[PDB]
Structure 1
């Protein structure tokens, strides 16, 4: 059924193989073949070749390491490429097929309890906001997204019979240059990327995929609405918005200073003028019609009656080149009086464009208006002047420490030592105060100053540049009020969404109480304007108590918050962190969104997309359209057909599973005193912090979530994503409640979704490679622990399969199952090679010798490649 896929992968492999024979001989190709074959033979049980593989690897000279690593990495990359094409291909999976949306609409029409009026309102309340986050393992000096768009185009064109002989020969010639380019044009980062680089990477995603993707999705959305429901959404209604954390998230990242943020903000505005300039140039050429409505004829008046439309567009172009010119000056550190037509508000762009639209529509030229004009008009509300808004995120602790320094300096006392009650008292008092609190000439510590300057950047940036201020480690009501106070002493002249981030088991359990108390403060209710945003940190919570407990805690917290706000008349918007079932993408994501507590999506969908997944969710415009469509279908269905409330007996099983699984999980991660040492040997955890990967960088409770998950993904154990789940399920089965579990799996989405996430993690895990790493990097004294963790997975897989009444992992998702099988095959060699690299690297620093550049770079290629093949592992 996937013959086209197998073929394409085989054809690309040849082109790459030939490109390698030219560059640096065929010796490298022989090595890649030997390692590939030996590795496969070792997995089959041939212990003779296992030794042969080991020897083969130790004999690779440092001069071969890089070429070899790149070979495997390239084959994987072409495999991924072929896979992505097969997904959006009509003859393949047809991911960008508008049918995905129609299927949902039709389902809703056949529902008796649903009246067209209640459905029409659900569509009008649609709201999606995707927040781009940095890519943790981007090793290339420059972004190569545009190239992949071209390789895809070649595949789309070649995917056709009745194709001319000389035409096919021409496409192949181009494809050969494209591959060759990737092999010779590879600049591994020598240094760690700066926030500004990560920000630019995000800009590349916008123009190469989102720019076309959003308008195309909106185009299809309306078309399906009218065809199935009988009406389109108003032109002014654009339910999609893109935001970013690059340059805004400074949580545990000292490199993101107030200046970097200020810089990134100008840079975004600049890029926005660059992209809108191209759009406007088109309109200035096409919109030449003469006939226009009286009103429009006014805005242009004299000198503009000859070409009314062409007129306004040229003033817009002059306007744009003006601001762009100014920005380029400010970006170079040059101060200069801001021009007249400086653009700072999307309204300034929308006004003239919308006018032209209105006119053309009236004077009988809708086909034109709803063409390129409608696209630019939508890009204005989705991207606008700032291009992509950004959130600011800092930990509660930093705010507390800065305030404590401020109070001690003024002689008021020590904020850091006051009880929660006293803090609230102090904050409410100063929030209502008209007398300033912040000293004019103050020389605070470095950290405190950064907290103060960041807030100054927020107050200076045009309104609409910053979307929200997120508070990591939020625990108490004062954590939320503190930030509102600093923003006040900064000169903020408008409402700023401040969202608490509960990223701990305890904090999630208290989340509802914390919000109840906040909403009881009359003053605070009048500040939020009936709108509150809360962030759920699933990844960090899972790292704290295990995925089982984490999941159940998240469900209860959301459900409580939904009701607490509903009752208080506050519109609650849940902000989802990275990972989890919601961050799986594709069909599973569509399902995970529906399995949330009733009302979870009434406040719209807002999720932070993980960097390592951007390519697979928004890599190409077609993929972008697919993703947004899946989300849209999920939101509508979840708001009209919410999941059933769980039976009292189910909640009791979840409470027990939560406790048992948390116990097992912390039993190893915390109690077991041989874990940490084992962890640092079996995984490349230590090198993830040292190598130049990403901007931001003790014990396990000191490590960040991403590194936690990534480390266990490199050695293929995936521990963080299953460690205690199966063991707790096993226990409940021994109590004869297996039938209760099976029932939950069938009738309670939350539960079926949790088991599904587990099935996928097991599908990517590789117990054989995990054992391989132990025998190469772990001390024989620690092998017992490793073998114990592996047997644990084997047992968990059986229990999970039994409760799902299946014979093999994720049989409900044949396509994804296949895709995974394909990627595991091409990823395999990188793992086998990485063990050797980690061994040499660790032998050098242990010998005192200096780190070998070749060994280090080769390591980066595997880390980045393995991550690219594994995708979402948590």
Structure 2
């Protein structure tokens, strides 16, 4: 205790310079490893004991109701320093860190799963080679696969581009799958107590944190999307989006949202600001699905504000449906909020997207 207190009196650190989005993103990893990593599964164990005791049933293993997300390196609202480059970086770092923590979990499992009794199905999944140490086989495979993607990300973090390894991890299913295979045979074969221990903790961290460790949220003001699209439209000679009435903008946006011909000029020369808007949707599009939780529009005032980001994301080439969220943060915006959403819900195109 004395040692620890002396530490803090003498271990003085004072930032001399403004922290950076990466620094802030790093503090969030500190919170994840020093507390959330143990905390979520314990929360899930207690919660589960209580359901059975009081209600008579336990949630199924596949149901993990908690998820942690971060805005660190995702929120650019009013922050010049959070550029598309930094987001790209932070996106990368999270994956590096999930590999770090996932490795510790798997080491433990590689040594503790010395069981040799497996189900037809599980033996099938390995069949020979590792059929004399089945659960250890699957954990050994994943360790390598994790070690591979780890190695890849430290290169990328360094600025080195190099083809990605055979077993690069991008999705939680790639982690979940094998882990769940062990659980099932362990349960099936009478090793329930081993299944429900460290593996269960890892199964739940997979869905709670997974591959990205902590999904990020992107957030930019509505105003900046308008400027990007105005600049685009004047360059194309189509007109000036930031002057059109709101009925016109929706018209323009629904037209283009349904259009099969592209709009974003192949090799263009926009202003810094606009490029940032364009680059960030490119990072979104580029990132593995499930890395980004949502696109938040601070200062959302009209139906065109939401349709705008959908247009940009489409131009950035995005394969999945990205949840966009208006952020009403004024008395009148709050007051108009329900009107803004019923109009949005009335557009059939929006409704189905």
For the aligned pair, the TM-score class normalised by the smaller chain equals over 0.9
Q: Over residues 139-167 of structure 1, what are the superposed CA-to-partner deviations in whole Å (9 max), with x where a residue is unaligned?
A: xxxxxxxxxxxxxxxxxxxxxxxxxxxxx
For residues 20 and 86 of structure 2, what CA distance do their matches in structure 1 show?
Answer: 9
Give the Å deviation of 1:355. Answer: 0.2
Q: Over residues 502-552 of structure 1, what are the superposed CA-to-partner deviations in whole Å (9 max), with x where a residue is unaligned?
A: 000000000000000000000000xxxxxxxxxxxxxxxxxxxxxxxxxxx
Q: Over residues 465-512 of structure 1, what are the superposed CA-to-partner deviations in whole Å (9 max), with x where a residue is unaligned?
A: 000000000000000000000000000100100000000000000000
For residues 254 and 220 of structure 1, what CA distance do their matches in structure 2 show?
Answer: 43
Give the Å deviation of 1:222. Answer: 0.5
For residues 304 and 324 of structure 1, what CA distance do their matches in structure 2 show?
Answer: 24
For residues 332 and 382 of structure 1, what CA distance do their matches in structure 2 show?
Answer: 28
Give the Å deviation of 1:291. Answer: 0.5
Q: 3-state DSSP class of the match of 1:469?
A: strand
Give the Å deviation of 1:274. Answer: 0.2
Q: Over residues 811-840 of structure 1, what are the superposed CA-to-partner deviations in whole Å (9 max), with x where a residue is unaligned?
A: xxxxxxxxxxxxxxxxxxxxxxxxxxxxxx
For residues 288 and 487 of structure 1, what CA distance do their matches in structure 2 show?
Answer: 48
Q: Over residues 174-223 of structure 1, what are the superposed CA-to-partner deviations in whole Å (9 max), with x where a residue is unaligned?
A: x0000000010011000000000000000000000000000000000000
Match of 1:258 among 65, 84, 107: 84
For residues 121 and 345 of structure 2, what CA distance do their matches in structure 1 show?
Answer: 48
Q: Over residues 398-430 of structure 1, what are the superposed CA-to-partner deviations in whole Å (9 max), with x where a residue is unaligned?
A: 000000000000000000000000000000000
Give the Å deviation of 1:331. Answer: 0.1
Aligned Cα RMSD in Å? 0.3
For residues 145 and 267 of structure 2, what CA distance do their matches in structure 1 show?
Answer: 39
- Structure number having the greater helix percentage: 1
Q: Over residues 233-275 of structure 1, what are the superposed CA-to-partner deviations in whole Å (9 max), with x where a residue is unaligned?
A: 0000000000000000000000000000000000000000000
Q: 3-state DSSP class of the match of 2:125?
A: helix
Match of 1:397 among 223, 228, 232: 223
Specify every segment of 5 or more residues in structure 2 that has no aligned partner in the other structure, as ranges: none
For residues 240 and 187 of structure 1, what CA distance do their matches in structure 2 show?
Answer: 34
For residues 416 and 221 of structure 1, what CA distance do their matches in structure 2 show?
Answer: 52
For residues 506 and 393 of structure 1, what CA distance do their matches in structure 2 show?
Answer: 21
Q: Over residues 812-870 of structure 1, what are the superposed CA-to-partner deviations in whole Å (9 max), with x where a residue is unaligned?
A: xxxxxxxxxxxxxxxxxxxxxxxxxxxxxxxxxxxxxxxxxxxxxxxxxxxxxxxxxxx
For residues 240 and 288 of structure 1, what CA distance do their matches in structure 2 show?
Answer: 31
Give the Å deviation of 1:304. Answer: 1.2
For residues 201 and 207 of structure 1, what CA distance do their matches in structure 2 show?
Answer: 10
> Is 1:514 the counterpart of 2:330 in the alignment?
no
Give the Å deviation of 1:336. Answer: 0.3
> Is 1:495 the counterpart of 2:344 in the alignment?
no
Q: 3-state DSSP class of the match of 1:467?
A: strand
Q: 3-state DSSP class of the match of 1:393?
A: strand
For residues 186 and 514 of structure 1, what CA distance do their matches in structure 2 show?
Answer: 51
For residues 498 and 194 of structure 1, what CA distance do their matches in structure 2 show?
Answer: 26
Q: Over residues 11-61 of structure 1, what are the superposed CA-to-partner deviations in whole Å (9 max), with x where a residue is unaligned?
A: xxxxxxxxxxxxxxxxxxxxxxxxxxxxxxxxxxxxxxxxxxxxxxxxxxx
Where does residue 451 of structure 1 map in the other structure?
277
Q: 3-state DSSP class of the match of 1:240?
A: coil
Where does residue 294 of structure 2 map in the other structure?
468
Where does residue 8 of structure 2 map in the other structure?
182
Give the Å deviation of 1:369. Answer: 0.1
> Is 1:481 the counterpart of 2:307 in the alignment?
yes
For residues 383 and 522 of structure 1, what CA distance do their matches in structure 2 show?
Answer: 35
Q: 3-state DSSP class of the match of 2:333?
A: helix
Q: Return structure 1 stretches of 4+ with deviation > 3 angstroms.
A: none
For residues 261 and 32 of structure 2, what CA distance do their matches in structure 1 show?
Answer: 44
Where does residue 326 of structure 1 map in the other structure?
152
Q: Over residues 98-151 of structure 1, what are the superposed CA-to-partner deviations in whole Å (9 max), with x where a residue is unaligned?
A: xxxxxxxxxxxxxxxxxxxxxxxxxxxxxxxxxxxxxxxxxxxxxxxxxxxxxx
For residues 494 and 475 of structure 1, what CA distance do their matches in structure 2 show?
Answer: 25
Q: 3-state DSSP class of the match of 1:350?
A: helix
For residues 332 and 28 of structure 2, what CA distance do their matches in structure 1 show?
Answer: 34
Q: 3-state DSSP class of the match of 2:81?
A: coil
Q: 3-state DSSP class of the match of 2:316?
A: coil
> Is 1:504 the counterpart of 2:344 in the alignment?
no
Q: Over residues 364-383 of structure 1, what are the superposed CA-to-partner deviations in whole Å (9 max), with x where a residue is unaligned?
A: 01000000000000000000
For residues 261 and 126 of structure 2, what CA distance do their matches in structure 1 show?
Answer: 48
Where does residue 342 of structure 1 map in the other structure?
168
Q: 3-state DSSP class of the match of 1:499?
A: strand
> Is 1:247 the counterpart of 2:86 in the alignment?
no
Q: 3-state DSSP class of the match of 1:215?
A: helix
Q: 3-state DSSP class of the match of 2:216?
A: strand
Q: 3-state DSSP class of the match of 2:68?
A: strand
For residues 248 and 451 of structure 1, what CA distance do their matches in structure 2 show?
Answer: 13
Specify every segment of 5 or more residues in structure 1 that has no aligned partner in the other structure, as ranges: 1-174, 526-874
For residues 259 and 460 of structure 1, what CA distance do their matches in structure 2 show?
Answer: 12
Please say which structure displays the higher CA radius of gyration: 1
